[PDB]
Amino acid sequence: GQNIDQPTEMTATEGAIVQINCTYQTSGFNGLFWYQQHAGEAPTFLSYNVLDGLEEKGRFSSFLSRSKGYSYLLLKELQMKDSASYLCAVKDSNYQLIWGAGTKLIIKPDIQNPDPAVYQLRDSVCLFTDFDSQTNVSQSKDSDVYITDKCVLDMRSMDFKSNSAVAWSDFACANAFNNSIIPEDTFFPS
Amino acid sequence: GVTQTPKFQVLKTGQSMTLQCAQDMNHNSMYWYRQDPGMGLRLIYYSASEGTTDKGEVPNGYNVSRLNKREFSLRLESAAPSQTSVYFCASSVWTGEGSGELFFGEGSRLTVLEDLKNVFPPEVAVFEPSEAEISHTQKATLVCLATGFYPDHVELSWWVNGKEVHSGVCTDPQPLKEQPALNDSRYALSSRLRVSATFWQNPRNHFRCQVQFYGLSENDEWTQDRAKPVTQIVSAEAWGRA
Amino acid sequence: RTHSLRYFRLGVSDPIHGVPEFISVGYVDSHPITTYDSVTRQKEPRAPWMAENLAPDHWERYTQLLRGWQQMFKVELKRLQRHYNHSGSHTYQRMIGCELLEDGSTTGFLQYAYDGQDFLIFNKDTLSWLAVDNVAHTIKQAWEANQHELLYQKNWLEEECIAWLKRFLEYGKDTLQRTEPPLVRVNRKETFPGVTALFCKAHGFYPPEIYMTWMKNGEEIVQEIDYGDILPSGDGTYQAWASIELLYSCHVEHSGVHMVLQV
Amino acid sequence: MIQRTPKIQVYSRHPAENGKSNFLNCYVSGFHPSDIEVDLLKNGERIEKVEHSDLSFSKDWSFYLLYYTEFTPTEKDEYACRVNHVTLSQPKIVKWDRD
Numbered sequence: 001g002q003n004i005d006q007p008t009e010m011t012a013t014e015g016a017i018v019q020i021n022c023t024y025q026t027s028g029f030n031g032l033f034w035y036q037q038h039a040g041e042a043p044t045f046l047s048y049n050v051l052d053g054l055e056e057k058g059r060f061s062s063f064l065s066r067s068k069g070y071s072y073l074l075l076k077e078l079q080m081k082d083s084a085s086y087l088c089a090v091k092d093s094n095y096q097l098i099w100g101a102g103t104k105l106i107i108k109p110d111i112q113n114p115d116p117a118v119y120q121l122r123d124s125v126c127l128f129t130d131f132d133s134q135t136n137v138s139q140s141k142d143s144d145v146y147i148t149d150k151c152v153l154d155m156r157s158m159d160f161k162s163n164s165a166v167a168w169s170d171f172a173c174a175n176a177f178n179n180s181i182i183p184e185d186t187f188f189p190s
Numbered sequence: 191g192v193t194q195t196p197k198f199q200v201l202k203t204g205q206s207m208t209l210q211c212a213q214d215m216n217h218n219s220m221y222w223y224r225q226d227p228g229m230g231l232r233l234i235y236y237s238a239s240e241g242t243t244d245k246g247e248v249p250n251g252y253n254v255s256r257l258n259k260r261e262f263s264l265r266l267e268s269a270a271p272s273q274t275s276v277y278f279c280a281s282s283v284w285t286g287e288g289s290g291e292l293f294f295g296e297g298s299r300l301t302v303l304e305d306l307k308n309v310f311p312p313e314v315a316v317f318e319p320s321e322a323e324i325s326h327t328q329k330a331t332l333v334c335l336a337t338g339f340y341p342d343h344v345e346l347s348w349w350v351n352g353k354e355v356h357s358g359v360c361t362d363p364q365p366l367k368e369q370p371a372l373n374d375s376r377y378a379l380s381s382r383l384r385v386s387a388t389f390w391q392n393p394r395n396h397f398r399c400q401v402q403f404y405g406l407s408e409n410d411e412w413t414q415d416r417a418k419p420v421t422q423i424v425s426a427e428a429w430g431r432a
Numbered sequence: 433r434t435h436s437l438r439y440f441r442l443g444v445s446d447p448i449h450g451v452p453e454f455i456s457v458g459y460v461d462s463h464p465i466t467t468y469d470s471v472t473r474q475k476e477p478r479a480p481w482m483a484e485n486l487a488p489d490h491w492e493r494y495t496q497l498l499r500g501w502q503q504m505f506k507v508e509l510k511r512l513q514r515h516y517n518h519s520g521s522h523t524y525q526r527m528i529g530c531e532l533l534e535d536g537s538t539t540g541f542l543q544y545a546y547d548g549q550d551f552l553i554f555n556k557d558t559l560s561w562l563a564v565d566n567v568a569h570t571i572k573q574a575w576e577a578n579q580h581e582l583l584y585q586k587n588w589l590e591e592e593c594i595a596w597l598k599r600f601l602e603y604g605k606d607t608l609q610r611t612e613p614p615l616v617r618v619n620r621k622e623t624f625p626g627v628t629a630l631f632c633k634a635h636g637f638y639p640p641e642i643y644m645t646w647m648k649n650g651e652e653i654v655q656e657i658d659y660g661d662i663l664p665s666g667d668g669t670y671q672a673w674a675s676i677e678l679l680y681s682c683h684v685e686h687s688g689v690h691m692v693l694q695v
Numbered sequence: 696m697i698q699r700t701p702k703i704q705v706y707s708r709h710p711a712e713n714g715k716s717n718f719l720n721c722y723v724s725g726f727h728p729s730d731i732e733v734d735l736l737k738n739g740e741r742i743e744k745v746e747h748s749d750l751s752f753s754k755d756w757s758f759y760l761l762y763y764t765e766f767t768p769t770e771k772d773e774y775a776c777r778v779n780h781v782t783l784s785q786p787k788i789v790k791w792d793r794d
Binding site: 004031033035039040041042043044045048050087089091094095096097098099100101102115117119120121122123124125127129130146147148149151152153154155156157158162164166168187189 | 228229230231232233278285286287288289291292293294295296297315316317318319320322323326327329331333335357358359360361362363364366368378380382384386
């Protein structure tokens with residue numbers, strides 16, 4: 001065939017639904033596969049469709065429309081563990097697989113009680129934590145100032161989830177996350 | 191099902207390499223793919239069955255051998271930096287003619303470098319929880335930093351009282367670049383372990399951030415003043431404080 | 433006009449000095465289009481309109497698949513021979529293909545034979561296999577447990593096969609879609625004393641599909657009619673005949689043209 | 696196992712006329728298994744310049760083949776098709792009925 005297109009990335013909320021589309025333009029069609037690939041892990045088979053319809057396996061369902069040349073992978077009741085890349089692949093007329101570039105799925109946790117704060121840790125490091133999942137963390141402008149992306153940790157026993165971004169490097173915790181639109185009520189201890 | 195080796199490898203340009211793949215599922219077809227950022231899996235070579243092999247989409251610089259039904263090895267005759275990639279071996283019950291899915295190996299991370307002079311293990315440091323966070327939330331977050339390492343071949347893990355923990359942990363999925371403008375930038379990786387203020391307040395509780403680094407092998411040549419940047423574990427630790 | 437595409441796979445265990453252990457041949461209507469065997473280990477075109485229109489990657493790709501399908505057939509015939517407690521040389525055959533009828537409707541078939549007798553017949557409408565005996569029934573249960581493979585085979589017969597056939601029909605249009613009308617004559621002769629034989633003989637026609645019959649006073653015959661096979665004359669055309677023993681007329685229909693030869 | 700002996704038909708490409716160039720065909724069909732030997736003969740002797748199709752497959756699982764040679768029929772020359780197959784104890788010589 002020639003082309004397979006799926007979005008680069010998708011973000012949705014924990015507990016909600018996401019639909020990942022895959023369109024293909026090929027010289028023949030012998031089936032469409034979906035694979036899940038956790039970060040740093042091997043891809044694993046999720047589904048196969050070759051005729052029209054929707055098939056479901058647990059919270060995951062896969063649809064195919066042969067005339068529209070598209071499929072979707074639908075995930076219901078989204079969980080944090082669904083954060084992964086999803087790969088679409090089509091088998092062409094010569095039974096060769098054509099791989100999509102994959103869709104990275106990001107899940108926004110449900111933050112029950114937000115407490116936005118920027119703390120200082122000693123061996124210095126700046127920790128922006130407990131903010132609501134709508135907050136986006138932007139990178140730094142300074143060369144020797146490093147800012148990580150958001151990380152969701154889960155304190156299983158306490159059924160508590162929290163967002164955090166670490167900053168390190170003149171440098172103060174007061175201006176560490178200045179290049180980001182942080183909540184107006186972010187607690188800055190002294 | 192599919193066993194692939196090695197998990198990590200550093201090569202110097204011009205060096206030869208053989209990637210091994212074996213499957214005990216009695217599968218007929220075997221495949222070697224490379225995975226690169228921003229693109230779909232690309233087939234290097236494949237073997238429809240025992241006794242035959244053929245080129246995929248990116249065969250230049252490689253060759254393969256279907257040794258028997260079980261094994262399919264991938265060889266880099268003269269490694270080049272462009273061959274820096276994630277390699278996946280895969281197998282299927284029958285040939286591509288059918289509905290059968292692929293079974294993938296665990297992947298092999300290969301880094302090809304002109305010289306081994308920029309290879310560095312990480313320096314690891316543990317940052318103890320902020321007093322302010324303990325009084326404001328009754329929670330205590332430990333932060334770990336693995337910095338200055340190259341290539342990005344690390345695995346970070348938290349260890350509490352000699353046992354590995356997963357709860358209250360979040361490690362960055364990708365390390366960031368310390369010199370974003372440089373082609374051979376070194377890397378940094380952060381992780382957090384969040385515990386209850388009472389757990390951190392217990393002085394019997396020992397917290398250790400462990401970083402496994404995959405670098406040079408015993409065979410690799412080293413004449414530099416600094417210690418040989420071999421595969422090694424680098425740790426930083428902290429004990430509970432009242 | 434009705435057209436068909438079909439691919440055959442033949443496996444022979446313990447073959448003689450010159451018999452290949454595996455052969456695969458493709459046809460469009462009565463024309464060979466492709467060949468592969470366990471001696472050459474290469475898939476090759478068998479029609480110049482196939483060779484001219486398919487790039488070398490087609491033959492390179494299918495050479496690999498056929499080497500794999502040859503190995504799979506060797507194993508399947510070993511397993512079948514074990515189920516039957518058979519020794520010596522036995523054959524396994526596969527036939528897959530489709531037809532595009534004149535009215536636009538289609539047919540698809542996928543069948544297997546063991547020692548040249550029906551073994552397994554796929555029913556693409558219920559996604560089930562029809563088994564001739566207990567050995568075939570054992571295979572049927574395993575194949576029927578793989579729902580996705582059944583759907584894939586239905587899609588192949590109904591969509592892919594028809595698309596391949598339309599493509600090949602266009603490649604070889606000057607051969608497959610031409611018409612060479614028949615040359616038809618009636619020969620009369622006293623055979624056994626008082627027994628007159630009437631032969632209506634046709635030759636030089638293409639496509640091979642022809643209708644030939646004998647009529648008496650305009651109405652259909654109730655007497656014995658002998659029919660000759662439709663045979664290849666070796667130049668791309670065919671020959672056939674119908675005979676009776678003696679107002680008689682021979683009726684011939686070929687590619688929408690009716691012909692009558694009154695005796 | 697059921698073995699099927701070949702049907703053997705010997706005929707000219709065009710209606711035969713002595714002194715006029717033609718083609719002699721031998722169509723061997725409906726046989727199973729596939730191993731077969733076919734020769735065309737002029738007065739009991741094997742013809743060297745003989746063309747043949749590849750082994751071909753019927754939908755009924757049997758096989759067929761066409762052997763042919765350019766020839767000029769005469770009143771004296773006798774032509775035949777000689778075939779050997781596992782179902783035959785001896786090769787079968789099938790004579791052309793001279794159209």
